[PDB]
Paper text:
The sequestration of ethanolamine metabolism within a BMC is thought to protect the cell from the acetaldehyde produced as an intermediate in its breakdown and to prevent the loss of this volatile compound and its carbon from the cell.
The crystal structure of a CD1925 variant, truncated at the N-terminus by 16 amino acids (CD1925(17–157)), was solved by molecular replacement and determined to 1 Å resolution. Two chains were present in the asymmetric unit, with residues 28–153 visible in chain A and 29–157 visible in chain B, with the majority of the C-terminal His6 tag also visible in the latter chain. The protein belongs to the [name] family of cupins and has the distinct β-barrel fold associated with these proteins. The surface of CD1925 does not display the distinctive charge distribution patterns seen for the oligomeric BMC proteins CD1908 and CD1918; instead its surface has irregular patches of positive and negative electrostatic potential. In the place of the histidine residues are aromatic (Trp94) and hydrophobic residues (Leu 96, Ile134) and in the fourth position a glutamic acid residue (Glu100), which is also present in the cupins with epimerase activity. Because of strong sequence conservation seen in this area for the [name] family and the fact that this region is solvent accessible and it corresponds with the position of the catalytic site of other cupins, this region may act to bind ligands, or act as a catalytic centre (starred residues).
Numbering used by the authors:
A (entry chain A): 28 to 153
B (entry chain B): 29 to 165
The structure:
């Protein structure tokens, strides 16, 4: 396969992914503008594979950063704790919980310790 | 009011404690076969989430036919979900993911049991039909 994780990509495009085999690396580092931030985003589907829904793996360690979303997002927290700071308020999810974030939200992704989560977005392509 | 634990912020940003999401008979999908056991519980109204649909699905000892004229991502929490497409099988168990592109004619096949989150586009997946509604009038 041409990816570095384990999947079964069927002829039809239907795909299973063994998510524990998805490992982030430095090519997935997100530039927040602050080089000390440690944030990884690893898209799991090309646009050709999934033209409408985006889906990837995000990991953060001891980092809080500002970001504005151009898309709707569902985050399913696999491990750790993710805090979302919005307008001075906090919304949090730990392992096995989810967060929905509407398009246009001006947030901080805030991870005092560690978090690993799937993100599903719409649209995949701006 | 909903029957699960969530924090719905003023901004629309919402956390959900998914283990508190319990399916009930109000969520039972009538497949046509009375012995089938399928539950679908949407977790967001259209006003809450106008583009992404998201809910909890459970199945037990059931396989049924479905055509998805919408895209779907499933995260399998417990059990095993099989997707049968053109005589082939794609499977995900606890901790694994499935993507189903729009236009897929499948069987959802759960000979054992499965509990999974689904995320769809468009949001109102159950109205992606000629009737524009969840049930035929
Ligand atoms: Mg064929």
């Amino acid at each position: 396969d041409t990816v570095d994780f384990v999947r079964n990509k069927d002829i039809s495009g239907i795909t299973s992914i063994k998510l524990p085999t998805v490992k982030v690396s430095e090519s997935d580092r997100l530039d927040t503008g602050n080089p000390s931030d440690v944030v990884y985003t690893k898209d799991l589907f090309t646009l050709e594979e999934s033209p409408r829904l985006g889906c990837g793996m995000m990991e953060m360690k001891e980092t809080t950063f500002d970001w504005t979303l151009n898309y709707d997002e569902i985050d399913y927290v696999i491990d750790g704790t993710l805090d979302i700071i919005i307008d001075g308020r906090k919304v949090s999810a730990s392992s096995g919980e989810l967060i929905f974030i509407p398009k246009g939200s001006k947030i901080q992704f805030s991870v005092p310790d560690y978090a690993r989560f799937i993100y599903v977005t719409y649209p995949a392509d701006w």
